[PDB]
Design a protein around this ligand. Structure first.
Ligand code: DMU
Ligand code: DMU
Ligand code: DMU
Ligand code: DMU
Lengths: 264, 332
């Protein structure tokens, strides 16, 4: 019925698609549960596919994306080697999800070629940015936003792009992406402001900068409002994706109301 | 000159790969690490041998390299023993891979060709790598099975892609039957080549053999079976004749260089023997029991070792002489 019902049912669809795949490739119970806990990553393909009208195609695209996004997160876990999962399972499963994603994605694009074009377009900016990020810590909001604009904006924006290519009409590609890129920074900040109490982890960068006073409350607030506005702007372009308006709001207020206080 | 094309191809592939790794933030370490993947940068050359256009062959050969290197980089990441930076490893892996997909698809006979191929058996490859790295094989049957995934399977996909992007006249299944045959030969070579690095202690097949759990003659047989298989696939019309010496070169390298390091005294096992009929009796003598041997026309005359000091004697037609006794002739 309501929209929260579709999101919830999409998340489930995607989680199940992902796990069937993880298990039928040899991944273990640990790994299958690991991937099933990737809550927001399994839900975001839903948002990126809001412009897609056919529900059949929407579902298909939605999960092909969940597959690749899960894959990239597995790789990120592989490089950091801190989750306690088996590196072999991690590398092998990761690769297998990605290959299924390409395949399913290309089976849905107008032009199969569009998928690799997109993934290539800024592969250097993303992988290059992922290294530099992990290399040096940022020391102010400006460095933070730049660092974040890669493992966040660039990373999620490619999927907005793919989502627009595997969806057909009723799709304004630039805007879908503009949306993915703003929403990403928002959730990135949140993830950077949440600490979940795991081994040798400590405090999110941005969180740290906030506590050292090196980054000000109002500026983080400013930023959040900039991203909110930018997201709303993108779901308004024709033909809009009105459904994302409450979503934009939900996650943005969430950081404002819930998370920020812990640091101010 | 085909050894000249080869060398030139490997340098080209090598530069393509180090431009990428460096342009993406890979450090000197890593750039140096990818430059050292010899066979991996050279093998794309053999896969494109059926390619008639030199520009296309070039492009496919170097794009195949990006991916193959990218795959080995991921394997180095799962093992975490290179001492290289995990991040850079991961990042660079993905960048090459993406470039690889883009390049291969720009040359493909069909837009779904590349992902069709990478997908066909992603499970067989991936689930297999996990099986392999989990249980050590414990006889040849097991060794051949494991090997046939990170080896035959892994490469065959590239053989298949090579044909998908090699313009016209590519006998697909053969290009690929070659990749899989040849891959296993090379995998045996790597399991028996000892590089003496951080835990790169003793190849499973090398171990197995030292443990006598695997029979030299059985390992010679397989090489021979693999050789035949590769030669046949290179013969299918329109054939890739130039790969024939390539096949022999690698197969023989294992037979002649690597095998001995692990068998030792005798490779075959069927210890050579001579059969004759001295003094009414039927006799057989080990070629290791032989002392002296000479030729008198088309007969072979010789002496051997019997009960302690006691000397034995015999003469056989050179047509009845084991290849191993005749070698003593042209040695004596
Ligand atoms: C989507 C594109 C944008 C990228 C930005 C990141 C988006 C996700 C925001 C928060 O993500 C969470 O990160 C946690 C920490 O990294 C994970 O919990 C981790 O720590 C918890 C600690 O309680 C454990 O329970 C979990 O098993 C373990 O996965 C959790 O799975 C994941 O949902
Ligand atoms: C080769 C590219 C492969 C794709 C990589 C991106 C895929 C999407 C995963 C994003 O996951 C987030 O990645 C951040 C960085 O990886 C982590 O932040 C952690 O690390 C950041 C940079 O190292 C710091 O800014 C944060 O404070 C710290 O919490 C964060 O927890 C994690 O949930
Ligand atoms: C290809 C189809 C079938 C797949 C199986 C792969 C076939 C194996 C061929 C030989 O592999 C060699 O193994 C070495 C292992 O040591 C590599 O050096 C690696 O290790 C060296 C130390 O031993 C370092 O100096 C190098 O940087 C590092 O690349 C070397 O370059 C590589 O050619
Ligand atoms: C998800 C799949 C993606 C990666 C696909 C692999 C791409 C090419 C990798 C092949 O490289 C070889 O891999 C073997 C196995 O990884 C290694 O053997 C080592 O490990 C084997 C199994 O763990 C044993 O059979 C051998 O004895 C031992 O030398 C070998 O040295 C290494 O050069």
């Amino acid at each position: 019925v309501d929209d929260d019902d579709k999101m919830l049912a999409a998340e489930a669809a995607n989680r199940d698609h992902v796990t069937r795949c993880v298990a039928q490739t040899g991944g273990s119970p640990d790994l299958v549960a690991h991937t099933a806990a990737l809550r927001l990553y399994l839900r975001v393909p839903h948002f990126l596919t809001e412009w897609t009208t056919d529900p059949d195609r929407r579902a298909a695209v939605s999960r092909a994306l969940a597959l690749d996004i899960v894959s990239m997160k597995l790789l990120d876990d592989l490089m950091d080697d801190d989750t306690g999962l088996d590196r072999v399972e991690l590398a092998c499963v990761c690769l297998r999800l990605h290959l299924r994603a390409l395949h399913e994605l290309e089976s849905l694009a107008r032009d199969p070629k569009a998928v690799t074009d997109i993934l290539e377009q800024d592969a250097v900016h993303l992988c290059g940015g992922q290294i530099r990020t992990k290399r040096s810590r940022a020391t102010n909001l400006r460095e933070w936003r730049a660092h974040a604009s890669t493992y966040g904006s660039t990373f999620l924006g490619r999927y907005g792009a793919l989502a627009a290519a595997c969806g057909g009409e009723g799709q304004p590609a630039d805007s879908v992406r503009e949306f993915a890129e703003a929403f990403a920074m928002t959730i990135t900040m949140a993830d950077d402001l949440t600490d979940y109490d795991r081994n040798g982890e400590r405090d999110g960068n941005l969180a740290h900068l906030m506590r050292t006073g090196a980054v000000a409350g109002q500026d983080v607030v400013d930023l959040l409002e900039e991203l909110r506005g930018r997201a709303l702007a993108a779901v308004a372009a024709p033909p809009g994706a009105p459904g994302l308006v409450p979503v934009v709001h939900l996650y943005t207020d969430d950081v404002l109301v819930r998370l920020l206080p812990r640091h101010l």
